[PDB]
């Protein structure tokens, strides 16, 4: 399945790939973004990474501003959602649905030696492929997982209160009003120009400063949330490496090094959360130094791209 850089981009790109809708995948694979929300941090919500969620509104703007591709959010009810489902499958073959991940649990934490696997009410995105009498078939493209789900569990997952808001059978319809094809170099230049002009690198510096100040915070779950959030950043870096190789792009020489830097930050956050360390100072230092390296990189991309 299409990985994207987060749960939302994965679902859009998988839909696009299966229905070969032009430009969606390229606009996702060329995304370059970082955010930090200090208020979400202290409410232990998803507070950093590539984009705010669950819907990547900035990606939705990029789709409309580059390709004239709109994403239309549909809200429904208990009595209507499945009937509307059958009409969408008959017309488009697939439905992108906002789901409570509590009822999915698509990822294997035991693979990373985390056996104390807390079930949380997190918003996620699935692609509905089939509606049966008493069950549905869904793809979780982000966790490369498909499953048949009971109609009861499916309806409940789509009507659940999550830590990032209330789901009401939300579905997301892509349609091109007239697709404009973009060169990969154009897509990357806009992203890297915006990244510098909005000083997105400064949000990495903020993140680093807030990590330093958790020195004497007995609660460590911010580190687990951070670990999960930064997966999107690792993916963007990997996506650019794949674009570089596929299109033979000119990149600054330290792109693999920056990915390695982000992988290390994630490793140290995971180790801190799982009580393998006591080094908030060391993690803040790494975040504040990759902030400088990401700024330098972005500036060199505009020159050599």
PDB file of C-alpha atoms in Angstrom, residues 81-257:
ATOM      1  CA  UNK A  81     -23.704   6.111   7.076  1.00  0.00           C
ATOM      2  CA  UNK A  82     -23.844   2.491   5.668  1.00  0.00           C
ATOM      3  CA  UNK A  83     -26.618   3.249   3.054  1.00  0.00           C
ATOM      4  CA  UNK A  84     -24.512   6.276   1.857  1.00  0.00           C
ATOM      5  CA  UNK A  85     -21.525   3.825   1.928  1.00  0.00           C
ATOM      6  CA  UNK A  86     -23.169   1.421  -0.623  1.00  0.00           C
ATOM      7  CA  UNK A  87     -23.888   4.395  -3.002  1.00  0.00           C
ATOM      8  CA  UNK A  88     -20.201   5.596  -2.713  1.00  0.00           C
ATOM      9  CA  UNK A  89     -18.825   2.027  -3.378  1.00  0.00           C
ATOM     10  CA  UNK A  90     -21.242   1.730  -6.393  1.00  0.00           C
ATOM     11  CA  UNK A  91     -20.081   5.167  -7.783  1.00  0.00           C
ATOM     12  CA  UNK A  92     -16.322   5.321  -6.804  1.00  0.00           C
ATOM     13  CA  UNK A  93     -15.445   1.717  -5.673  1.00  0.00           C
ATOM     14  CA  UNK A  94     -13.787   2.967  -2.399  1.00  0.00           C
ATOM     15  CA  UNK A  95     -14.708   5.209   0.613  1.00  0.00           C
ATOM     16  CA  UNK A  96     -12.019   6.950   2.788  1.00  0.00           C
ATOM     17  CA  UNK A  97     -13.398   6.900   6.412  1.00  0.00           C
ATOM     18  CA  UNK A  98     -12.172   8.536   9.682  1.00  0.00           C
ATOM     19  CA  UNK A  99     -12.041   5.723  12.330  1.00  0.00           C
ATOM     20  CA  UNK A 100     -11.150   5.344  16.053  1.00  0.00           C
ATOM     21  CA  UNK A 101      -7.856   3.309  15.938  1.00  0.00           C
ATOM     22  CA  UNK A 102      -8.912   1.782  19.344  1.00  0.00           C
ATOM     23  CA  UNK A 103     -11.097  -0.670  17.285  1.00  0.00           C
ATOM     24  CA  UNK A 104      -8.353  -1.288  14.600  1.00  0.00           C
ATOM     25  CA  UNK A 105      -4.938  -1.782  16.389  1.00  0.00           C
ATOM     26  CA  UNK A 106      -3.102  -2.369  13.027  1.00  0.00           C
ATOM     27  CA  UNK A 107       0.520  -1.986  14.398  1.00  0.00           C
ATOM     28  CA  UNK A 108       2.669  -4.611  16.251  1.00  0.00           C
ATOM     29  CA  UNK A 109       4.445  -2.857  19.217  1.00  0.00           C
ATOM     30  CA  UNK A 110       5.773  -6.289  20.419  1.00  0.00           C
ATOM     31  CA  UNK A 111       8.095  -6.189  17.301  1.00  0.00           C
ATOM     32  CA  UNK A 112       9.847  -3.163  19.000  1.00  0.00           C
ATOM     33  CA  UNK A 113       9.844  -4.925  22.472  1.00  0.00           C
ATOM     34  CA  UNK A 114       6.856  -2.822  23.772  1.00  0.00           C
ATOM     35  CA  UNK A 115       4.471  -5.424  25.365  1.00  0.00           C
ATOM     36  CA  UNK A 116       2.558  -2.929  27.638  1.00  0.00           C
ATOM     37  CA  UNK A 117       0.452  -1.857  24.573  1.00  0.00           C
ATOM     38  CA  UNK A 118      -2.061   0.785  25.903  1.00  0.00           C
ATOM     39  CA  UNK A 119      -5.246   0.884  23.699  1.00  0.00           C
ATOM     40  CA  UNK A 120      -5.924   4.640  23.028  1.00  0.00           C
ATOM     41  CA  UNK A 121      -8.853   6.429  21.247  1.00  0.00           C
ATOM     42  CA  UNK A 122      -6.691   7.882  18.384  1.00  0.00           C
ATOM     43  CA  UNK A 123      -8.213   9.064  15.051  1.00  0.00           C
ATOM     44  CA  UNK A 124      -7.001   7.082  11.959  1.00  0.00           C
ATOM     45  CA  UNK A 125      -8.012   6.644   8.247  1.00  0.00           C
ATOM     46  CA  UNK A 126      -9.113   3.393   6.498  1.00  0.00           C
ATOM     47  CA  UNK A 127     -10.195   2.685   2.864  1.00  0.00           C
ATOM     48  CA  UNK A 128     -13.570   0.807   2.827  1.00  0.00           C
ATOM     49  CA  UNK A 129     -13.533  -1.705  -0.122  1.00  0.00           C
ATOM     50  CA  UNK A 130     -16.696  -3.826   0.591  1.00  0.00           C
ATOM     51  CA  UNK A 131     -19.976  -3.693   2.643  1.00  0.00           C
ATOM     52  CA  UNK A 132     -21.481  -7.127   3.606  1.00  0.00           C
ATOM     53  CA  UNK A 133     -24.626  -8.059   5.666  1.00  0.00           C
ATOM     54  CA  UNK A 134     -22.785  -8.126   9.069  1.00  0.00           C
ATOM     55  CA  UNK A 135     -19.178  -7.020   8.194  1.00  0.00           C
ATOM     56  CA  UNK A 136     -17.015  -4.666   6.030  1.00  0.00           C
ATOM     57  CA  UNK A 137     -13.540  -5.062   4.393  1.00  0.00           C
ATOM     58  CA  UNK A 138     -11.138  -2.102   5.082  1.00  0.00           C
ATOM     59  CA  UNK A 139      -7.475  -1.370   4.111  1.00  0.00           C
ATOM     60  CA  UNK A 140      -5.190   0.419   6.649  1.00  0.00           C
ATOM     61  CA  UNK A 141      -2.665   1.619   4.002  1.00  0.00           C
ATOM     62  CA  UNK A 142      -0.461   3.443   6.618  1.00  0.00           C
ATOM     63  CA  UNK A 143       0.153   0.162   8.612  1.00  0.00           C
ATOM     64  CA  UNK A 144       0.087  -2.043   5.422  1.00  0.00           C
ATOM     65  CA  UNK A 145      -2.809  -4.043   7.007  1.00  0.00           C
ATOM     66  CA  UNK A 146      -6.279  -5.158   5.737  1.00  0.00           C
ATOM     67  CA  UNK A 147      -9.056  -6.896   7.775  1.00  0.00           C
ATOM     68  CA  UNK A 148     -12.780  -7.797   7.798  1.00  0.00           C
ATOM     69  CA  UNK A 149     -14.424  -5.809  10.679  1.00  0.00           C
ATOM     70  CA  UNK A 150     -17.866  -6.624  12.254  1.00  0.00           C
ATOM     71  CA  UNK A 151     -20.589  -4.078  11.205  1.00  0.00           C
ATOM     72  CA  UNK A 152     -21.035  -3.293  14.973  1.00  0.00           C
ATOM     73  CA  UNK A 153     -17.268  -2.515  15.513  1.00  0.00           C
ATOM     74  CA  UNK A 154     -17.192  -0.505  12.196  1.00  0.00           C
ATOM     75  CA  UNK A 155     -20.230   1.700  13.137  1.00  0.00           C
ATOM     76  CA  UNK A 156     -18.798   2.188  16.712  1.00  0.00           C
ATOM     77  CA  UNK A 157     -15.249   3.087  15.420  1.00  0.00           C
ATOM     78  CA  UNK A 158     -16.849   5.817  13.175  1.00  0.00           C
ATOM     79  CA  UNK A 159     -19.068   7.315  15.986  1.00  0.00           C
ATOM     80  CA  UNK A 160     -16.412   7.379  18.799  1.00  0.00           C
ATOM     81  CA  UNK A 161     -15.063  10.336  20.874  1.00  0.00           C
ATOM     82  CA  UNK A 162     -11.237  10.522  20.268  1.00  0.00           C
ATOM     83  CA  UNK A 163      -8.519  12.585  22.084  1.00  0.00           C
ATOM     84  CA  UNK A 164      -8.490  14.854  18.929  1.00  0.00           C
ATOM     85  CA  UNK A 165     -12.331  15.253  18.635  1.00  0.00           C
ATOM     86  CA  UNK A 166     -15.701  13.509  17.916  1.00  0.00           C
ATOM     87  CA  UNK A 167     -15.972  11.289  14.753  1.00  0.00           C
ATOM     88  CA  UNK A 168     -19.463  11.387  13.091  1.00  0.00           C
ATOM     89  CA  UNK A 169     -19.018   8.894  10.170  1.00  0.00           C
ATOM     90  CA  UNK A 170     -16.646  11.426   8.449  1.00  0.00           C
ATOM     91  CA  UNK A 171     -15.682  10.394   4.859  1.00  0.00           C
ATOM     92  CA  UNK A 172     -13.380  12.208   2.356  1.00  0.00           C
ATOM     93  CA  UNK A 173     -14.174  12.390  -1.413  1.00  0.00           C
ATOM     94  CA  UNK A 174     -11.343  13.352  -3.865  1.00  0.00           C
ATOM     95  CA  UNK A 175     -12.430  14.951  -7.186  1.00  0.00           C
ATOM     96  CA  UNK A 176     -10.354  16.859  -9.808  1.00  0.00           C
ATOM     97  CA  UNK A 177     -12.153  19.970 -11.224  1.00  0.00           C
ATOM     98  CA  UNK A 178      -9.435  19.876 -13.979  1.00  0.00           C
ATOM     99  CA  UNK A 179      -6.018  18.352 -13.097  1.00  0.00           C
ATOM    100  CA  UNK A 180      -2.892  20.505 -13.722  1.00  0.00           C
ATOM    101  CA  UNK A 181       0.291  18.342 -14.072  1.00  0.00           C
ATOM    102  CA  UNK A 182       3.332  19.680 -12.086  1.00  0.00           C
ATOM    103  CA  UNK A 183       7.086  18.903 -12.522  1.00  0.00           C
ATOM    104  CA  UNK A 184       8.619  17.312  -9.338  1.00  0.00           C
ATOM    105  CA  UNK A 185      11.166  20.253  -9.257  1.00  0.00           C
ATOM    106  CA  UNK A 186       8.260  22.829  -9.186  1.00  0.00           C
ATOM    107  CA  UNK A 187       6.465  20.937  -6.323  1.00  0.00           C
ATOM    108  CA  UNK A 188       9.741  20.690  -4.276  1.00  0.00           C
ATOM    109  CA  UNK A 189      10.747  24.386  -4.875  1.00  0.00           C
ATOM    110  CA  UNK A 190       7.339  25.695  -3.550  1.00  0.00           C
ATOM    111  CA  UNK A 191       7.581  23.363  -0.472  1.00  0.00           C
ATOM    112  CA  UNK A 192      11.231  24.320   0.384  1.00  0.00           C
ATOM    113  CA  UNK A 193      10.592  28.082  -0.259  1.00  0.00           C
ATOM    114  CA  UNK A 194       7.458  27.922   2.027  1.00  0.00           C
ATOM    115  CA  UNK A 195       9.441  25.862   4.652  1.00  0.00           C
ATOM    116  CA  UNK A 196      12.089  28.688   4.878  1.00  0.00           C
ATOM    117  CA  UNK A 197       9.632  31.668   4.535  1.00  0.00           C
ATOM    118  CA  UNK A 198       7.341  30.204   7.316  1.00  0.00           C
ATOM    119  CA  UNK A 199      10.551  29.381   9.349  1.00  0.00           C
ATOM    120  CA  UNK A 200       9.290  25.766   9.943  1.00  0.00           C
ATOM    121  CA  UNK A 201      12.918  25.021  11.104  1.00  0.00           C
ATOM    122  CA  UNK A 202      12.181  27.376  14.092  1.00  0.00           C
ATOM    123  CA  UNK A 203       9.357  24.976  15.185  1.00  0.00           C
ATOM    124  CA  UNK A 204      12.108  22.256  15.559  1.00  0.00           C
ATOM    125  CA  UNK A 205      14.074  24.726  17.815  1.00  0.00           C
ATOM    126  CA  UNK A 206      10.890  25.337  19.951  1.00  0.00           C
ATOM    127  CA  UNK A 207      10.346  21.512  20.209  1.00  0.00           C
ATOM    128  CA  UNK A 208      14.005  21.172  21.392  1.00  0.00           C
ATOM    129  CA  UNK A 209      13.606  23.970  24.029  1.00  0.00           C
ATOM    130  CA  UNK A 210      10.372  22.324  25.413  1.00  0.00           C
ATOM    131  CA  UNK A 211      12.174  18.875  25.583  1.00  0.00           C
ATOM    132  CA  UNK A 212      15.065  20.443  27.641  1.00  0.00           C
ATOM    133  CA  UNK A 213      12.445  21.732  30.191  1.00  0.00           C
ATOM    134  CA  UNK A 214      10.969  18.177  30.773  1.00  0.00           C
ATOM    135  CA  UNK A 215      14.227  17.479  32.785  1.00  0.00           C
ATOM    136  CA  UNK A 216      12.116  17.060  36.014  1.00  0.00           C
ATOM    137  CA  UNK A 217       8.727  15.923  34.515  1.00  0.00           C
ATOM    138  CA  UNK A 218       7.937  12.509  36.177  1.00  0.00           C
ATOM    139  CA  UNK A 219       5.418  11.824  33.306  1.00  0.00           C
ATOM    140  CA  UNK A 220       7.344  10.517  30.208  1.00  0.00           C
ATOM    141  CA  UNK A 221       4.379   9.869  27.783  1.00  0.00           C
ATOM    142  CA  UNK A 222       5.231  13.140  25.868  1.00  0.00           C
ATOM    143  CA  UNK A 223       8.348  11.180  24.646  1.00  0.00           C
ATOM    144  CA  UNK A 224       6.165   8.269  23.308  1.00  0.00           C
ATOM    145  CA  UNK A 225       3.797  10.790  21.576  1.00  0.00           C
ATOM    146  CA  UNK A 226       6.903  12.594  20.148  1.00  0.00           C
ATOM    147  CA  UNK A 227       8.355   9.243  18.895  1.00  0.00           C
ATOM    148  CA  UNK A 228       5.036   8.478  17.048  1.00  0.00           C
ATOM    149  CA  UNK A 229       4.683  12.100  15.703  1.00  0.00           C
ATOM    150  CA  UNK A 230       8.253  12.150  14.187  1.00  0.00           C
ATOM    151  CA  UNK A 231       7.578   8.974  12.053  1.00  0.00           C
ATOM    152  CA  UNK A 232       6.023  11.452   9.510  1.00  0.00           C
ATOM    153  CA  UNK A 233       9.376  13.412   9.358  1.00  0.00           C
ATOM    154  CA  UNK A 234      11.444  10.169   8.791  1.00  0.00           C
ATOM    155  CA  UNK A 235       8.925   9.279   5.971  1.00  0.00           C
ATOM    156  CA  UNK A 236       9.189  12.752   4.255  1.00  0.00           C
ATOM    157  CA  UNK A 237      13.050  12.375   4.321  1.00  0.00           C
ATOM    158  CA  UNK A 238      12.787   8.797   2.868  1.00  0.00           C
ATOM    159  CA  UNK A 239      10.183   9.995   0.254  1.00  0.00           C
ATOM    160  CA  UNK A 240      12.646  12.745  -0.918  1.00  0.00           C
ATOM    161  CA  UNK A 241      15.518  10.133  -1.113  1.00  0.00           C
ATOM    162  CA  UNK A 242      13.169   7.988  -3.333  1.00  0.00           C
ATOM    163  CA  UNK A 243      12.263  11.082  -5.505  1.00  0.00           C
ATOM    164  CA  UNK A 244      16.041  11.943  -5.762  1.00  0.00           C
ATOM    165  CA  UNK A 245      16.838   8.381  -7.064  1.00  0.00           C
ATOM    166  CA  UNK A 246      13.701   8.071  -9.329  1.00  0.00           C
ATOM    167  CA  UNK A 247      14.116  11.560 -10.984  1.00  0.00           C
ATOM    168  CA  UNK A 248      17.975  11.848 -10.585  1.00  0.00           C
ATOM    169  CA  UNK A 249      17.509  15.160  -8.623  1.00  0.00           C
ATOM    170  CA  UNK A 250      20.453  17.278  -7.322  1.00  0.00           C
ATOM    171  CA  UNK A 251      20.268  17.262  -3.460  1.00  0.00           C
ATOM    172  CA  UNK A 252      22.687  18.575  -0.782  1.00  0.00           C
ATOM    173  CA  UNK A 253      25.003  15.668   0.194  1.00  0.00           C
ATOM    174  CA  UNK A 254      23.770  15.215   3.850  1.00  0.00           C
ATOM    175  CA  UNK A 255      20.124  14.023   3.184  1.00  0.00           C
ATOM    176  CA  UNK A 256      20.794  10.400   4.402  1.00  0.00           C
ATOM    177  CA  UNK A 257      22.665  11.960   7.422  1.00  0.00           C
TER     178      UNK A 257
END
